[PDB]
Write a protein that binds this ligand. Sequence first.
Ligand SMILES: O=P(O)(O)O[C@@H]1[C@@H](O)[C@H](O)[C@H](O)[C@H](O)[C@H]1OP(=O)(O)O
Ligand SMILES: O=P(O)(O)O[C@@H]1[C@@H](O)[C@H](O)[C@H](O)[C@H](O)[C@H]1OP(=O)(O)O
Lengths: 263, 263
Amino acid sequence: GSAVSKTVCKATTHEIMGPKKKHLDYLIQCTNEMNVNIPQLADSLFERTTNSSWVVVFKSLITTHHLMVYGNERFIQYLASRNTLFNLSNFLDKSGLQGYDMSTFIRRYSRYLNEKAVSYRQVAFDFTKVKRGADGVMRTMNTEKLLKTVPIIQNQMDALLDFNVNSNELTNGVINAAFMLLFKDAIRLFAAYNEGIINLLEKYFDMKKNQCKEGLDIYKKFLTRMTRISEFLKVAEQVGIDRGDIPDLSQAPSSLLDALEQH
Amino acid sequence: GSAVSKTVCKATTHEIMGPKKKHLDYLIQCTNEMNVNIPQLADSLFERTTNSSWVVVFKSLITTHHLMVYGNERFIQYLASRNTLFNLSNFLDKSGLQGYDMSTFIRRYSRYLNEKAVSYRQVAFDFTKVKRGADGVMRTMNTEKLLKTVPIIQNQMDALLDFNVNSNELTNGVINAAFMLLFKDAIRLFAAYNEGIINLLEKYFDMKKNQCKEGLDIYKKFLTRMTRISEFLKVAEQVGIDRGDIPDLSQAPSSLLDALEQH
Ligand SMILES: O=P(O)(O)O[C@@H]1[C@@H](O)[C@H](O)[C@H](O)[C@H](O)[C@H]1OP(=O)(O)O
Ligand SMILES: O=P(O)(O)O[C@@H]1[C@@H](O)[C@H](O)[C@H](O)[C@H](O)[C@H]1OP(=O)(O)O
């Protein structure tokens, strides 16, 4: 409460760096205790995003992201259960040039975090954390659910990609911390999108006519998102990310000629 | 040969970013083929470090590092088997201000890479890649070897820490790529140093008098290196590294009072 509320403030000071690890680890522990009240924790983070300063606001967003990623699942479950989330579509800190320039990234990042909660609300699991491989959800899921799901991933991906940053704009510790978390989500989200497309192809020839028509549209939009993701990973390469952490995109786009299996 | 030699050139162009992933992955495959001649591969990288331009030289160093980390063990085994390695102690590119400023980091980075090969030569394994835990080498190694080894780790660590960079000097893609690989080595190297200290303490009370005297000196220098590593991880925090990747240093420095178990 007070100890939680104080940690929230310390994670979101005016200092120009991302939230400190020591504050973030204490918050993560908070989400794992059955006696902590999650809504009060969340409320304190939403209140910090009514501040007028870009630094405070951007740090409150990054804290929320890190908790969705490393915190107990009850945190994102609460965020998904609310009706309204971040309303920063018109944010503008005009106090200095860094302010103006960062305001745009705040808008875009907050939209991605909203879309991340909405996706959890719709399918009741986190695309970034579920079992991959061949024994996983995205690999072993029925054809009806599949057709319903893949388009939700696509949507979460588009909001992520709209962050639209260039290497020459990653110039301070705050936006750099945001980018590192976005990178982590992008690679896990791609893995899951890819798995769904693999299942699709597996089942495509064996399926109803109008189904086939829906699948065709999904494979279609996947190929177009494949090139956007390439551009995103190139910004990561330019910035200096370890090349061992960057996934190899040499997987699944040869086959567009089932655009005729609808004879 | 020619295909290897050409890839080396492409990994080390004048362009101001780290070596591209596609070139690095081809080199990694080269080290895993029984028919590729390792010495010719290595020689081509050493030749690039006689270039006059800081960009070429720094990229040849980073390529060599990435191969020591992700390549087949026969690569680092060859480097350790040579008598002379990098001789860049007097490097200076004076063609522009970026040149002057980067020359110092080239000197320091090349010394760390030399020390990394020397350490492999001395103990016949890579501190960064061996089994950790309780079923690992660093946890289960005899008291004589231990006393001999821990000081080699300490030495490799000091050369790593002398890189001595501040957040405000990480301003281009080349030095940033170097830093990401150094970060990865620093955390694995610390894990192994820590494991050795744990074993030490385990065995300390049950050991010969002069042995005890040696152990005491090692624990001593470990505590002093513990604070340097803290400073290093703080530069990583400032830059924006995901706080989940940064290790928790809340392990093993209470006990200095065996400085008396020598009664
Ligand atoms: O060394 P760390 O753990 O950074 O803690 C620092 C500490 O060095 C000291 O400067 C505090 O006054 C400062 O406010 C605190 O930060 P905090 O208040 O955010 O804990
Ligand atoms: O798209 P990537 O794979 O970067 O390859 C690029 C390619 O886009 C094109 O500009 C080449 O002329 C350029 O030299 C090459 O780089 P390369 O010669 O280093 O392969």
